[PDB]
Design an enzyme around this catalytic site. Structure first.
Site, PDB file in Angstrom:
ATOM      1  N   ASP C  14      17.879 -19.414  34.198  1.00 17.39           N
ATOM      2  CA  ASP C  14      16.579 -18.867  34.570  1.00 17.39           C
ATOM      3  C   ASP C  14      16.255 -17.564  33.836  1.00 17.39           C
ATOM      4  O   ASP C  14      16.232 -16.490  34.445  1.00 17.39           O
ATOM      5  CB  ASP C  14      16.495 -18.670  36.077  1.00 17.39           C
ATOM      6  CG  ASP C  14      17.033 -19.858  36.849  1.00 17.39           C
ATOM      7  OD1 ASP C  14      16.427 -20.947  36.764  1.00 17.39           O
ATOM      8  OD2 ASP C  14      18.061 -19.705  37.540  1.00 17.39           O
ATOM      9  N   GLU C 186       8.016 -26.804  39.119  1.00 22.62           N
ATOM     10  CA  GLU C 186       8.489 -25.476  39.485  1.00 22.62           C
ATOM     11  C   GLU C 186       8.349 -24.575  38.266  1.00 22.62           C
ATOM     12  O   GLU C 186       7.782 -24.967  37.241  1.00 22.62           O
ATOM     13  CB  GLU C 186       9.933 -25.526  39.988  1.00 22.62           C
ATOM     14  CG  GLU C 186      10.940 -25.946  38.930  1.00 22.62           C
ATOM     15  CD  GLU C 186      12.167 -26.612  39.523  1.00 22.62           C
ATOM     16  OE1 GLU C 186      12.210 -26.792  40.758  1.00 22.62           O
ATOM     17  OE2 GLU C 186      13.087 -26.959  38.752  1.00 22.62           O
ATOM     18  N   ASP C 334      42.033  -3.026  31.779  1.00 22.23           N
ATOM     19  CA  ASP C 334      43.330  -2.488  32.166  1.00 22.23           C
ATOM     20  C   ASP C 334      43.293  -1.750  33.499  1.00 22.23           C
ATOM     21  O   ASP C 334      44.330  -1.239  33.935  1.00 22.23           O
ATOM     22  CB  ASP C 334      43.865  -1.558  31.076  1.00 22.23           C
ATOM     23  CG  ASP C 334      44.229  -2.294  29.806  1.00 22.23           C
ATOM     24  OD1 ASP C 334      45.193  -3.089  29.831  1.00 22.23           O
ATOM     25  OD2 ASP C 334      43.555  -2.073  28.779  1.00 22.23           O
ATOM     26  N   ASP C 336      41.946   1.172  34.595  1.00 29.56           N
ATOM     27  CA  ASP C 336      42.279   2.591  34.590  1.00 29.56           C
ATOM     28  C   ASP C 336      41.183   3.467  35.177  1.00 29.56           C
ATOM     29  O   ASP C 336      41.478   4.575  35.638  1.00 29.56           O
ATOM     30  CB  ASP C 336      42.573   3.073  33.167  1.00 29.56           C
ATOM     31  CG  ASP C 336      43.322   2.053  32.349  1.00 29.56           C
ATOM     32  OD1 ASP C 336      44.553   2.190  32.192  1.00 29.56           O
ATOM     33  OD2 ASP C 336      42.667   1.118  31.848  1.00 29.56           O
ATOM     34  N   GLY C 363      45.825   2.782  37.800  1.00 32.38           N
ATOM     35  CA  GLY C 363      46.203   1.848  36.766  1.00 32.38           C
ATOM     36  C   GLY C 363      46.348   0.413  37.218  1.00 32.38           C
ATOM     37  O   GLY C 363      46.595  -0.461  36.375  1.00 32.38           O
ATOM     38  N   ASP C 529      47.904  -5.599  37.039  1.00 24.20           N
ATOM     39  CA  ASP C 529      47.860  -4.562  36.015  1.00 24.20           C
ATOM     40  C   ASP C 529      46.636  -4.709  35.122  1.00 24.20           C
ATOM     41  O   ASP C 529      45.936  -3.727  34.848  1.00 24.20           O
ATOM     42  CB  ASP C 529      49.139  -4.593  35.180  1.00 24.20           C
ATOM     43  CG  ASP C 529      49.299  -3.358  34.316  1.00 24.20           C
ATOM     44  OD1 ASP C 529      50.307  -3.273  33.584  1.00 24.20           O
ATOM     45  OD2 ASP C 529      48.419  -2.472  34.366  1.00 24.20           O
TER      46      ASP C 529
HETATM   47 CA   LIG Z   1      46.838  -0.552  33.928  1.00 27.71          CA
END
Ligand SMILES: [Ca+2]
Ligand SMILES: [Ca+2]
Ligand SMILES: [Ca+2]
Lengths: 531, 532, 536
Positions: C14, C186, C334, C336, C363, C529
């Site tokens: 859309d 529509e 990651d 962080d 982290g 992690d």
């Molecule tokens: Ca990390």
């Protein structure tokens, strides 16, 4: 004496029990297999032996094109006036709101034959029965079928007078019983004991709801009075009973004064984890409907099964003296009586035992899903654990020629392990399975090579309760296994269902040639070894 | 000259177009209806007339117990070496992952017989075709069937050499074509024009995705090259076209030098409110698959359909003079009218008789409409969306298993039936029974319509008006009363039923049944079919 | 300039295309995912980047308990009078003969600027559109729903006058269009070019029958005339075209005088051996519906797509400089920072301390234990879109379960009844194990529960990885990061496709992401992690 039920193992439903002096006979429905009707013999009601297959001619019984679970339904075999009387129904419609068929009557002066040509008896319904009254009159009972007469909502039992000097039936029909709440009324039988006429009917359907209902009256045309317990034998209220689907009784009095009746029963296999009373949890029966026996005692003018209403594994035998695994090497001139074909007699069109002495040559015909002409020689499963083996010589030249070993229930449910030819590779081995008409061919994209210098190819099927597997060999000493594990409980009535769930599983040989050019497979033997 | 496709109306699929001199013939499949194969004739490709029903003996064609949508599939009619050649397939399996059947060959020195006994031609596949090469050799083309050969994933076209003097086929098979992404390859035909071999195949299935594919090659064993546009005729991309399912062509050259091609087509009925491209929105076809004609032009070594790929109502005719251009059967002769057909069995004394009572058709009592073995049914095809069929009936049933009347039939699990029966406490009554996907519907069994005791004849009538049809009855022939049930005509259609047996179309005819087997008969005075 | 379609890969249906000055924006529907609406920005119509996710608060969007394929449907983003306008529909009913929902209006001065509180604008239908006429008046178009208004047989477009000063909608409704035979009308949009009003509608449904229909009229209230070809763009007649389901256009004029139109399209994968036009033979689309662009030329008062009606892989760009692009497909997070990367989304609820936290253990992404993947209320699931047919997703997890009701791992998700899940849990006898659970049309498949994979006790971390290769995808695990072992189950990727599931809710695509569940409610957490997504 002690009899262990079922007396007849494997696909053996709708027992019809009679006697000629001290000899006892049971007739069993055969459905789409040829020859129809199997008659077993005993003198002690414990050990039974095949003695006759009467419907073995096309002029007497023709099934070509009949649908699955059709053909010969419940037969009725009785003895009176110095000759045997056999009534059978040839059902032509199964998958439909209502069915059509034909009823015939044949006679013979002895159980071995010769059997007279059939006499038409009308097409009004199924489960026919002939009642020989003590005054010389004979009556013909059946359950009408057609629109609104398949328990939607009508299920009646009617009676006609039969003239045996001429062979005609009176046109007047008299209704004897209209139904009980359980429904599916069928299996009419009339007996005369003391001063009452007893009518025995089967109710609830051939599934786990099966039951036997007994009524009684003073005059033949009713009105009929129901049993105080309504049902006389059933195993529906005991889901953990070893024997199940107990119904369709056939009552008989022995020459010693005792009373016995034969009924159909099944031994189910239960999947782990599934609840007992859930859909499919009561079990699966790959061996089909078997036949048992039960003792009957008399209280206040009504019959009762000794020990209760359920089917027992052990019953007490008559007061008579007791009277004193399978392989076919194909050495003789006729096929073994335990081997049957599909819908057509075994003649030179399907195979021959004289072209190559010592071997069963099977010619190439339609595939296993055909209802017209297939070269299939099969026998009944009789044990949950067994092994079948054969030795075959076959040299196909294109992909439409095949031959091998199969496990068969109906045209839409079977398995098949066979040797064929692949262009550019040579002789190979595959497996084809139909499950609810859904194909499954896992080995077609990479089949098993067969050595060129292999003169013979051995094939073998091993069944262990819920599973069965295939194996092959080229020297007869070292065996290799096809890496597909199959489920035996799918060759069972409780899984397929439908309006055609009345047969059981079979094991046998098969050779096919879709092209029609011409091929033959030689089988040295066929062994069935149980555990 | 102007031709108005659909040329043949009703259940008339798989056209095989041939010619002898100035006479043109079309052979159409009949499936489970007896006699098999209908051959029409024309001299101008516009007006067609029935001329022969060759497979009219049990020794040449046996259908007893054949499944629905089985029987005679696409035939092949060809003329060479002074005699006609007709190849047909008798299919025995339909509702399975793969099918089985037989192939045969019959010849005749003229279109009206006598036809020789069949010669077996192998059971390897369907849509058989015979190619008469110009050097005298004959080739036999067919599409193989069996496991993994029903477009899952294999769909090939193979060829064998045929020996006419001996009647045998060479064991060697040569593969000509393996299939396009459309799949469902069938309907092989070979033609030689200029210095090329042309192979015409049908692809996509006999539903709305039907198409015709043309290949060409220099030598008969291939390799073949596809058409520049792949498809030469198709109507899948135009959902609002009057003619749909354009496919399964049979190509012929006329004696005037022009090229024509016959194909199957259908005219659908659309329910109101259903989206066009949704499930079932493209239409329902109660008249089945009908046959049309098209003109073919040549452009740089390839054939093209004049006007476009799609099927057209009007086409241009050949350069020949136009030959000069309702139905009822009074049952006065020794044989039934050629427009009436039975189911799987010939019309003999077991089914009925036209001699026992002169002037009337006496139908005996046999199995019901859901039977595949023996029923006393005489029926004809629907050819219009609006029509009326009428009959006059004399019947005296005794019990409830005796019935006879008027019916509309598609297959054994889909039909309607208005009949006269006997009730125990009332007498003669009128009831209706309908099967819809094998589901019964009997709305008049609790309160049936009484019939006067001194009514010698009972009239029956079916009125079809596009989407719906109704039944009616009378006892004097002047005043009519309507049975208060409305039926949907689009449910006797291929797009509704479905399955692996969606190949026939609706029929209208007379039935008499006796489940009990004692023996009964119903006399029908006439059978009228008057279009609006 | 050459533009390669689709411009926005993955689940991105859309397209609502607008512009301010020389900046171009596309707003795409998000459905049951949070935050709703993704706005992409470009200056050359070739390279698009995410710039805003406006509906990011519960006060503006509350979807707890919404059914599958519900939530935010097709949005409308427009610019007029110095501020942006965003119309959205919150659909609450999907699996029913008719549907219910709510429409709202929000505004903001900048695309990232603060959006005002929503203004209720009626629940009468879906696909809302706002038309800014040149005389100052504003009109509100929508397609009504309810009984007998879902193409059985009614499908109409209606208009209401809108007052911006007071935020009121006039009660009177004016019907503009009643539908063509293809139906499912529509996607209403109004445009004014020359002296004509142009109404653009989408027809045939969002499946392979999708098409775009253009009408025109002199007055705004009609009557309207259909195009001289009914359809300006469709790909139903070309089953072998790379791009399918081409529809739901959104027309726009560039500042250079050219005309462009954004539309939704899909790239299907075809199983071998299945006929092209049979049931399911046209392909399966695991990546869902994606957005493309097309060029439009004008001929005798009607618009036409250059090159044909079908969707093309390559189109010609505008007369601007291609602002430089950058390397793609090597996305990783990651964990962080303080906020999740914008490519990761949650299910139906905003990401707060109830589901997880990025500050409890710096982290690492700590995901708390909540309901399973079949729940519509509260799942601790952080997932991202599939953008390629061949890719690998890898994560590293620390988890110490105690009983069998705690699990955490990696999953591939389409809806609540169709997903796969490879996780690490605890078994009473052995200890930590790896198992796989799959739902396929709501029937379970757990092949490793009887004999699971042992996990060493001294293993501090457990790596997980999913490798998708066209029609199949498989799972893998490791305990040291160097030696990998494969879970012996092969899964079908085409089953996480809208052509397979079907229903009245087949409007999305597949996702890949992390999931942690605790049915017991005792309390647990899984630390992840990183999350990587590497295209081939
Ligand atoms: Ca990390
Ligand atoms: Ca031997
Ligand atoms: Ca007459």
């Amino acid at each position: 004496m002690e009899i262990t039920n079922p007396i007849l193992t494997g696909f053996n439903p709708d027992p019809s029990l009679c006697r000629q002096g001290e000899d006892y006979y049971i007739a069993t429905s055969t459905f789409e297999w040829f020859p129809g009707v199997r008659i077993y013999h005993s003198r002690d009601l414990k050990n039974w032996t095949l003695v006759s297959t009467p419907l073995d001619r096309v002029s007497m019984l023709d099934m070509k094109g009949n649908p699955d679970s059709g053909g010969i339904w419940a037969p009725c075999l009785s003895y009176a006036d110095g000759k045997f009387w056999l009534l059978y129904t040839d059902v032509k419609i199964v998958d439909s709101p209502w069915k059509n068929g034909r009823n015939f009557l044949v006679t013979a002066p002895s159980i071995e034959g010769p059997w007279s040509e059939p006499i038409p008896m009308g097409n009004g319904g199924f489960d026919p029965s002939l009642f020989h009254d003590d005054d010389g009159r004979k009556y013909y009972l059946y359950r009408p079928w057609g629109p609104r007469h398949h328990s939607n909502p009508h299920n009646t039992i009617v009676m006609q007078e039969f003239d045996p000097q001429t062979g005609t039936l009176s046109p007047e029909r008299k209704t004897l019983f209209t139904g009980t709440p359980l429904c599916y009324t069928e299996g009419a039988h009339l007996y005369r004991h003391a001063g009452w006429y007893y009518l025995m009917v089967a109710e609830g359907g051939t599934s786990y709801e099966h039951a036997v209902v007994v009524l009684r009256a003073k005059t033949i045309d009713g009105p009929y009075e129901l049993h105080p317990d309504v049902t006389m034998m059933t195993s529906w209220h005991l889901p953990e009973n070893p024997l199940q689907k107990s119904g369709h009784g056939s009552l008989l009095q022995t020459h010693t004064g005792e009373w016995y009746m034969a009924y159909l029963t099944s031994r189910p296999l239960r999947l782990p984890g599934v609840p007992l009373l859930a859909s499919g949890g009561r079990g699966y029966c790959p061996l089909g409907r078997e036949t048992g026996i039960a003792r009957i005692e008399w209280r206040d003018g009504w019959p009762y099964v000794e020990g209760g209403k359920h089917a027992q594994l052990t019953v007490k035998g008559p007061q008579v003296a007791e009277q004193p695994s399978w392989r076919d090497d194909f050495d003789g001139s006729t096929l073994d009586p335990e081997l049957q074909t599909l819908r057509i007699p075994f003649d030179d069109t399907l195979g021959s035992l004289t072209a190559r002495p010592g071997y069963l040559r099977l010619y190439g015909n339609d595939s296993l899903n055909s209802t017209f002409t297939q070269s299939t020689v099969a026998r009944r499963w009789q044990h949950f654990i067994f092994r079948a083996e054969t030795r075959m010589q076959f040299s196909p030249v294109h992909f439409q020629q095949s031959a091998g070993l199969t496990c068969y229930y109906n045209s839409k449910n079977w398995s098949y392990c066979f040797v064929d030819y692949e262009e550019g590779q040579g002789r190979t081995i595959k497996v084809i399975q139909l499950d609810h008409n859904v194909p499954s061919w896992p080995l077609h994209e990479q089949p098993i090579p067969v050595p060129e210098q292999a003169e013979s190819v051995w094939l073998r099927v091993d069944v262990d309760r819920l599973v069965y597997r295939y194996s092959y060999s080229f020297d007869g000493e070292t065996w290799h296994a096809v890496p597909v594990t199959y489920e035996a409980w799918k060759l069972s009535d409780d899984y397929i269902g439908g309006r055609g769930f009345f047969t059981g599983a079979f094991v046998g040989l098969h050779c096919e040639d879709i092209s029609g050019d011409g091929c033959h497979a030689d089988f040295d033997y066929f062994t069935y070894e149980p555990a």
